[PDB]
Amino acid sequence: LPGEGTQVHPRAPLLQILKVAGAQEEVFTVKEVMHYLGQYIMMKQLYDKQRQHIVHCHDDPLGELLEVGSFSVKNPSPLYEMLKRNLVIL
């Protein structure tokens, strides 16, 4: 994924999720995209209530993009692979 200063444009399915999280922009840095994804998971309460580094996304639009039913915030590979598929580098 691109560096800190590099700007990206999220593909429609991802942009839609960032919009739910309150994103107004169309062009982001990777860190900004990550901020809104965290907001989204928090708002929809997709994290496991007891072990909160686990996210359950199996029946959510985010799970469709990630292509997994759950992931660990400490094993973020699925997230970065999703971003590679869904971010246009500007």
């Binding site: 860190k31 990550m34 901020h35």
Partner: peptide, 14 residues
């Protein structure tokens, strides 16, 4: 930790 705290760590890394 809380999810907020875990994600904040992840955000700071990326």
């Amino acid at each position: 930790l809380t999810f907020x705290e875990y994600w904040a760590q992840x955000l700071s890394a990326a």
